[PDB]
């Protein structure tokens, strides 16, 4: 599942009016997970505060590098809320 | 252990990663009695 | 050959359990070389501390915006010992 | 080193000459950090 700790930020700016870059550890030595089963829907769940409402530190249109233990590929956040769901890049 | 490396001026730092771990020791406990009947005090040479 | 001033960092997080994003420049301003010199194997050892027990700043993972003189890639870092090699993102 | 070699008489002086070179230390800058979060100051009985 999520782990918070393998969740880290990629863009420097505090700029609130831009996208955000993430960058998530799902290979061996953090989740261990395909990039299938991390790209699936509402697997970020977790990382909102309130997934029913759409608050949290994920926005529409941020950009995460998904490190899976197969292979690796740029997504971007589609919707937060019901569910967090991603797509390609 | 840490360790030293290198990187451009101006760059950000890099930290080398220290290790932790624990190691846990379990605590016993014994007991050394003794009984002296008090019969006995006048009866020995000794100090029971 | 590798040039440590022309390495840069990208991500901005110091979590140390997820990956990194690094920046290459080896345009004309740089170290002037391809990519696929750059991509070569054992290119970025000099990066690292100890390349032969895999100590340095580049972790398993991590992904490389390499800029060449002819091109840019993305490429992330499969191994750190006993070389560094990467591969296409 | 320098060396003496042998002339005739009257004939000019040939030195052996003496080679020098320049021995140049470049200078390198190193870094060892760590980073500790405070989210472990309450939850460590050391001072990390």
């Known amino acids: 599942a999520f782990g918070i700790n393998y969740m880290g930020?990629?863009?420097?700016?505090?700029?609130?009016?831009?996208?955000?870059?993430?960058?998530?550890?799902?290979?061996?030595t953090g989740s261990n997970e395909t990039v299938?089963?991390?790209?699936?829907?509402?697997?970020?769940?977790?990382?909102?505060?309130?997934?029913?409402?759409?608050?949290?530190?994920?926005?529409?249109?941020?950009?995460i590098i998904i490190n899976g233990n197969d292979a690796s590929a740029f997504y971007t956040v589609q919707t937060i809320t019901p569910n967090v769901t991603v797509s390609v890049f | 252990?840490?360790?030293?490396?290198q990187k451009a001026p101006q760059d950000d730092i890099t930290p080398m990663n220290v290790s932790n771990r624990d190691a846990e020791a379990v605590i016993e406990d014994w007991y050394a009695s003794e009984y002296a009947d008090r019969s006995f005090q006048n009866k020995l040479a000794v100090n029971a």
């Open chain 1, 9 to 28: 930020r990629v863009s420097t700016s505090a700029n609130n009016d831009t996208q955000k870059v993430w960058i998530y550890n799902g290979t061996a």
């Open chain 2, 1 to 5: 252990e840490g360790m030293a490396n």
């Open chain 1, 36 to 63: 299938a089963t991390i790209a699936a829907s509402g697997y970020f769940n977790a990382f909102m505060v309130n997934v029913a409402l759409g608050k949290g530190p994920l926005g529409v249109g941020d950009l």
